[PDB]
Design a protein around this ligand. Sequence first.
Ligand SMILES: OC[C@H]1O[C@H](O[C@H]2O[C@H](CO)[C@@H](O)[C@H](O)[C@H]2O)[C@H](O)[C@@H](O)[C@@H]1O
Ligand code: FES
Length: 108
Amino acid sequence: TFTKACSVDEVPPGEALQVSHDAQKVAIFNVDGEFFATQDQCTHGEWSLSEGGYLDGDVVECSLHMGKFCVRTGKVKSPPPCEPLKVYPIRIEGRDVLVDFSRAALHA
Ligand SMILES: OC[C@H]1O[C@H](O[C@H]2O[C@H](CO)[C@@H](O)[C@H](O)[C@H]2O)[C@H](O)[C@@H](O)[C@@H]1O
Ligand code: FES
């Protein structure tokens, strides 16, 4: 199941939005007009990447320790995080950005 998360126009390029499904929080990033979904919480600590992060192209920085992650793959790009982000498949259906919330994957 792909689930309605947000509208294409709700997240302009270079920006992030937090979405909720059941008990999980997911960050939606618009990289160059394409949408990517990762876990919202940084893996290194209790800090939100959509609300406390900064998006630099396809790379999100966590403001607490300046850890960095690729939003496309979840891959750690800069320390101190040890573990990559969960990433979730994305479908665009017209205006809708859809996330498959049950289908989290990990790079490693
Ligand atoms: O408030 C209940 C609804 O919450 C979500 O939808 C809101 O937030 C989205 C992303 O920020 C917006 O696209 C949407 O227009 C808002 O209504 C949730 O997706 C819905 O299923 C809930 O009914
Ligand atoms: S909490 Fe995100 S880098 Fe430490």
